[PDB]
Amino acid sequence: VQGPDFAAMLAARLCHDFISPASAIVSGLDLLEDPSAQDMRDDAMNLIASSARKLADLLQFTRVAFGASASAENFDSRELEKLAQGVFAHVRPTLDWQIEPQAMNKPSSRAVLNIAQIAASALPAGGVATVKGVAADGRFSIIADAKGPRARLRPEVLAGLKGEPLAEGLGGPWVQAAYLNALVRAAGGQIAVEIGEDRASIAAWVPA
Amino acid sequence: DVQGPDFAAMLAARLCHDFISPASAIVSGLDLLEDPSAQDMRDDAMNLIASSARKLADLLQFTRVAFGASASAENFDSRELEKLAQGVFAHVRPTLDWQIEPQAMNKPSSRAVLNIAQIAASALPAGGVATVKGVAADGRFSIIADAKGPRARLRPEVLAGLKGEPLAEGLGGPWVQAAYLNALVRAAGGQIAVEIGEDRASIAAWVPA
Ligand code: NA
Ligand code: NA
């Protein structure tokens, strides 16, 4: 019998992302109660508030990017931009959301959120993730261009985007890429990648 | 037609649902502190944040081992597993009676015992006691969680999940954990057994050890 290896890997990734702002809330509350750290009262309160914001943003994004079913549902592209903006708020790269306000089907919506976060993670020293999406020729086509110093799609991300098993690398970046590949291919669509100097692009289309 | 990540999405939906409850309470608590109209409830809002942060920390530490662990060989201290399971029971009406003698437990036993203990807590809608037993014998590690309390019940989606059956009547949340447990126990070469009585429900599992 096949184990829940893939679901465990996704669970491990989500825990890892949530534990960082959650433990900071615990540590911030520790500092408020500590009589020795009464000089950092304002800094501890700002740590709790920023970690609560980060955690709320990550959970709201996860809800649609990973928690959504494959059942038919339309999403507002403006609401999806809010979710992507939320995760980009706590990382060094900036977001250039160029999708004109419109209704997006479920595969398009799940795909655009995962593509935007993979583009952000391709930027280790900042830069810009440009997100484009057009409804044309019976498809919804997405392209996220990550431009910045040493922009790179890691080998486990490239393996995941092709639906290949995890070889060299961490499960965390691989599992999101493999999840995106499986939902796009289940919808009858395709994933494409572009790699250049200080640039990486992730493209996907789904029927629409 | 290609297979979608439907099962992984269901597990992700379940984890979000569990974490969003104490996380939104932290946001609401911080909203009350900043609200000039609610300056008379500063103490109550701070207690809401602190208790929700404790609940969230406990849920995340448990999830890390119950759902996030790989199938790779690793031993866990049963005392550390007790702390994780107790953290889950701390914020619900049922109580946990952990009767596993302090010992080393392999990856399948550890993952299984944590899921069984939480399924036992959820089988108690009006409180009671979940007794968790675990013995290393005959080349096996055998776990039994007995949930005893008023109207103790294993929901149909939990019974379907524990047998490795698809989701029929019920919610994905309780089904996905039960199906996850079934898949990790059967991958390890073990078996799951259930007992249902009046105001009692038991979940048993064995894995090779
Ligand atoms: Na940013
Ligand atoms: Na309790």
Written in H, E and C, the secondary structure of chain A is CCCCHHHHHHHHHHHHHHHHHHHHHHHHHHHHHCHHHHHHHHHHHHHHHHHHHHHHHHHHHHHHHCCCCCCCCCEEHHHHHHHHHHHHCCCCCEEEECCCCCEECHHHHHHHHHHHHHHHHCCECECEEEEEEEEECCEEEEEEEEECCCCCCCHHHHHHHCCCCCCCCCHHHHHHHHHHHHHHHHCCCEEEEEEECCEEEEEEEEEC
Please give the backbone phi and psi of residue A128, each rounded to the nearest 5 degrees, phi first: -125, 130
Token pair of B50, please?
């602190």
Task: Domain B73-209: give its CATH superfamily.
Answer: Histidine kinase-like ATPase, C-terminal domain (3.30.565.10)
Token pair of A132, please?
């484009």
List the resolution, Å. Answer: 2.3
Bridge partners, B75 (sequence order): B106
- The C-alpha atoms of residue A123 and residue B182 are separated, in whole angstroms, by 40
Task: Say yes or no for a CB contact (<8 Å) between B20 and A63.
Answer: yes
Nearest by CB to residue B9, choosing from A2, A3, A66, is A66
SS3 B22: helix
- The C-alpha atoms of residue B23 and residue A105 are separated, in whole angstroms, by 28
Buried b (16+ CB within 10 A) or exposed e, A35-52: eeeeeeeeebbebbbbbb
Helices (H) and strands (E) in chain B, counts: 6, 7
| Angle subtended at Cα B208 by Cα B205 and Cα B209, rounded to the nearest 5 degrees | 110
Q: How far is A67 from chain B (nearest CA, A)?
A: 4
Candidates B10, B14, B28, B30, partner chain A, best to mutate (most A CBs within 10 A): B30
Q: How far is A68 from chain B (nearest CA, A)?
A: 6
Q: Dihedral through CA A63, CA A68, CA A72, CA A75, nearest 10?
A: 30
Nearest of B189, B191, B193 to residue B208 by alpha carbon? B189
Cβ burial, residue A152 (10 Å; 0-12/13-18/19+)? middle
> Per the annotation, does B18 bind a ligand?
yes
State the CATH class of domain A1-71.
mainly alpha
Helix (H) or strand (E) holding B6: helix B6-34
Nearest by CB to residue A186, choosing from B4, B15, B30, is B4
Nearest of A85, A15, A87, A9 to residue B184 by alpha carbon? A9
Helix (H) or strand (E) holding B26: helix B6-34
Task: Say yes or no for a CB contact (<8 Å) between A18 and B19.
Answer: yes
Ligand with the closest atom to the CA of A86: 1
- The C-alpha atoms of residue B156 and residue B52 are separated, in whole angstroms, by 30
Q: How far apart are the first and last CA of chain B?
A: 40
Please give the backbone phi and psi of residue A162, each rounded to the nearest 5 degrees, phi first: -100, 0
- The C-alpha atoms of residue B146 and residue A186 are separated, in whole angstroms, by 41
| Angle subtended at Cα A110 by Cα A104 and Cα A113, rounded to the nearest 5 degrees | 100
Nearest by CB to residue B15, choosing from A14, A55, A68, is A14
Residue B104 contacts residue B75 (beta carbons within 8 Å): yes
- The C-alpha atoms of residue A66 and residue A10 are separated, in whole angstroms, by 9
Task: Say yes or no for a CB contact (<8 Å) between B19 and A19.
Answer: no
- The C-alpha atoms of residue A53 and residue B200 are separated, in whole angstroms, by 42
**How far does CA A200 lie from the centroid of its chain?**
15
Q: How far apart are the first and last CA of chain A?
A: 36
Please state which of the four CATH numbers 2.60.40.420, 3.20.20.450, 3.40.190.10, 3.30.565.10 is assigned to the domain occupying A72-208: 3.30.565.10
- The C-alpha atoms of residue B144 and residue B36 are separated, in whole angstroms, by 52
Nearest by CB to residue B15, choosing from A5, A11, A182, is A11
Task: Say yes or no for a CB contact (<8 Å) between B53 and A22.
Answer: yes
- Residues contacting residue A6 through CB under 8 Å, at least 6 positions apart: A175, A178, B5, B7, B8
Please name the residue that has the structure tokens 């596993």.
B100
Complete edge-to-edge strand list for the sheet that includes strand A139-147: A94-97, A128-136, A139-147, A199-207, A190-196
HSE-up (13 A, CA, CB side) for residue A85: 9
SS3 B67: coil
Residue spans per domain, chain A:
1-71, 72-208
- The C-alpha atoms of residue A25 and residue A33 are separated, in whole angstroms, by 13
Nearest of B157, B161, B130 to residue B146 by alpha carbon? B130
Token pair of B60, please?
């995340």
- Chain A contact set for B27 (CB, 8 A): 52, 56
Please give the backbone phi and psi of residue A138, each rounded to the nearest 5 degrees, phi first: 70, 20
Q: Into which CATH architecture does domain B1-72 fall? A: Orthogonal Bundle (1.10)
Nearest of B91, B133, B138, B87 to residue B112 by alpha carbon? B133
| Residues at Cβ < 5 Å from ligand 1 ion | A 88
Residue B178 contacts residue B161 (beta carbons within 8 Å): yes
